[PDB]
């Protein structure tokens, strides 16, 4: 039971991660468009979920320029990569194990 | 909002969104030939070697039935005056027949293999 | 070949050799003493046939 | 430059029939038209070089040698 | 505000900032001159540039900070030389969006053949834009990309009063 | 297969093969099985099976 839960519990806190990553990717891209409807629908939800994140770092990056921040970009790619490993190669022969994710 | 000076000529987004269609369905065109509503696309009519061989052809008829000894005429050129070796006296026409296969083309694959 | 193999691809090192000397194993529970040092799952033999087998898969 | 350079390069009669008749054996108007060209490119590197040894070389050879590697 | 056209050294220096996207995308070239020949021009003509655009790790990243500092808010420039330069600024963030894609690719799409259409097309579209550009910019005239050169002209007002 | 220019490009009837054959360069699974290097993302005793049953499916050794 607890390994099946386990790699449950991990296959879908990587599914989520990944589509965080993919709100965040949305963010930058629409924050080079300037005349956009942010209050509209859509936008209204995609701000809503990355509300609070972007919320949390807004005093860190000083207001040199208002126009944009990649910041939790490297942030959450770090923090995935973290999850990869937290949780060139040289070997002996070419390992087959380095195709798997 | 400021674009240029507008002496400088601007060129729209309609000619770059033509060119790229047009280039990608070229492409397209050329891997598959007879889906193009069942036919294919090609780029000229005629073969400048045929055309040059038919016209050659009504050329030297009609000499002949005026009276004359016939004349061929050379895609490239005639032949230069000179004494050391047969290819460098007809060289220009011997640089056009050299030229045949890739004048007729294509260079990309005539048939679709699927990797 | 050993010859075609031999020239297509090399190791090209960069970081010393990748082989070295082996270790022979005993078990716990002829006139040659055989090697022992590839009955292991890590070994470079068992590396050499998983990568075979995920090949043909 | 090219007229210039022309002045310089462009023979006359004499010089052809020169670089004629000793290259060859035979006067000129009595050749294949690649092997005429050869007399008047003769001709006409004779005085680039002379033009060179009489007029650049005569006054720039004062010898201050140095300056070797 | 300088208004005036372009002139040769521009030219030829905008043209040398049009070649780092093709740079940072010509990996995938042998996916599409396989099925076109014709093109097998271009597997070639990029080695000096690639050479010299990763002699320091850092190199690129203080060429964007060396245009965008001294090329695009400097108002003494003409401003086509500076739209130039703000469209390859722009194409190499659009090729690096696309490096930033294929690594995310998912295991069972990368083995398959649709990865290798992938590969063609990431290098065909950055290759389309690239001599587009490169056309225009010989001319000495404005292109207009959609999408993209909208951004590339309020880019250039905002970091022209980037000062006051 | 780096010391050569391993790809196959190449016209009308000047094609030439010599130990990288016609096979290797355009065709197939060695094509597609030469070019694995850029497929790396940049244990080995019970996952390698389990992963290889779960993701590539075939029933001449799964089934
Ligand atoms: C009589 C002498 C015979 C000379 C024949 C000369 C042929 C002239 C071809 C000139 C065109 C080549 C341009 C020079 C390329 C500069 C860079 C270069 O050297 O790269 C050198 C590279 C070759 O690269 C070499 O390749 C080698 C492989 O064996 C090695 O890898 C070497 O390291 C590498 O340097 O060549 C190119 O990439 C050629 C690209 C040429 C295509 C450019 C597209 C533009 C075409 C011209 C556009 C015309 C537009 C219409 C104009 C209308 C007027 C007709």
Not at chain 5, 84 to 112: F, K, R, S, Y
């Amino acid at each position: 039971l607890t390994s099946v839960y386990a790699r449950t519990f991990e296959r879908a806190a990587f599914g989520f991660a990944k589509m965080y990553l993919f709100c965040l990717f949305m963010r930058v891209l629409l924050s080079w468009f300037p005349s956009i409807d942010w209050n509209s629908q859509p936008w209204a939800f995609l701000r809503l979920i990355t509300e609070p994140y972007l919320q949390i770092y807004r005093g860190i990056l000083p207001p040199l320029f208002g126009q944009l921040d990649f910041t939790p970009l490297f942030g959450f790619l770090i923090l995935q990569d973290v999850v990869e490993l937290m949780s060139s190669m040289f070997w002996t022969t070419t390992d087959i194990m380095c195709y798997f994710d | 909002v400021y674009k240029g000076p507008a002496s400088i000529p601007h060129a729209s987004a309609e000619v770059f969104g033509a060119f790229f269609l047009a280039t990608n369905t070229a492409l397209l065109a050329h891997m598959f030939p007879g889906k193009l509503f069942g036919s294919e696309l090609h780029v000229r009519k005629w073969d400048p070697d045929y055309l040059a061989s038919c016209c050659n052809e009504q050329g030297m008829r009609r000499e002949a039935l005026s009276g004359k000894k016939p004349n061929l005429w050379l895609l490239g050129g005639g032949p230069r005056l000179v004494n050391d070796s047969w290819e460098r006296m007809w060289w220009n026409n011997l640089h056009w027949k050299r030229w045949k296969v890739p004048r007729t083309g294509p260079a990309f694959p005539q048939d679709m293999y699927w990797q | 070949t050993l010859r075609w193999r031999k020239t297509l691809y090399v190791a090209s090192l960069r970081r010393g050799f990748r082989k070295k000397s082996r270790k022979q194993r005993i078990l716990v529970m002829s006139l040659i003493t055989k090697p022992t040092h590839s009955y292991t799952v890590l070994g470079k033999r068992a590396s050499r046939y998983r990568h075979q087998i995920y090949k043909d898969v | 430059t090219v007229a210039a350079g022309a002045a310089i390069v462009v023979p006359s009669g004499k010089q052809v029939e020169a670089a004629s008749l000793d290259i060859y054996g035979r006067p000129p108007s009595q050749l294949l038209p690649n092997e005429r060209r050869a007399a008047e490119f003769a001709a006409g590197h004779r005085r680039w070089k002379g033009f060179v040894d009489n007029s650049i070389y005569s006054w720039t050879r004062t010898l201050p040698g140095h300056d070797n590697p | 505000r300088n208004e005036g056209p372009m002139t040769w050294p521009w030219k030829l220096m905008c043209a040398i900032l049009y070649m780092l996207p093709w740079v940072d995308v010509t990996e995938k070239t042998v996916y599409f001159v396989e099925r076109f020949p014709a093109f097998v021009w271009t597997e070639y003509f990029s080695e000096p540039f690639e050479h010299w655009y990763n002699i320091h790790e850092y190199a690129p990243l203080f060429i964007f900070f060396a245009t965008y500092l001294g090329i695009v808010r400097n108002k003494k420039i003409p401003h086509v030389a500076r739209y130039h330069v703000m469209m390859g600024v722009m194409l190499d963030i659009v090729a690096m969006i696309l490096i930033v894609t294929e690594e995310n690719l998912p295991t069972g799409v990368l083995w398959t053949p649709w990865s290798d259409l992938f590969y063609a097309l990431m290098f065909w579209f950055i290759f389309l834009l690239v001599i587009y550009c490169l056309f225009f910019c010989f001319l000495g005239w404005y292109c207009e990309i959609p999408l993209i050169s909208e951004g590339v002209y309020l880019q250039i007002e905002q970091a022209e009063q980037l000062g006051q | 297969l780096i010391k050569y220019q391993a790809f196959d490009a190449s016209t009308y009837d000047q094609g030439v093969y010599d130990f990288l054959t016609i096979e290797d360069l355009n065709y197939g699974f060695d094509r597609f099985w030469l070019r694995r290097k850029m497929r790396n993302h940049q244990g080995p005793r019970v996952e390698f099976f389990r992963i290889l049953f779960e993701q590539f499916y075939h029933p001449n050794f799964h089934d």
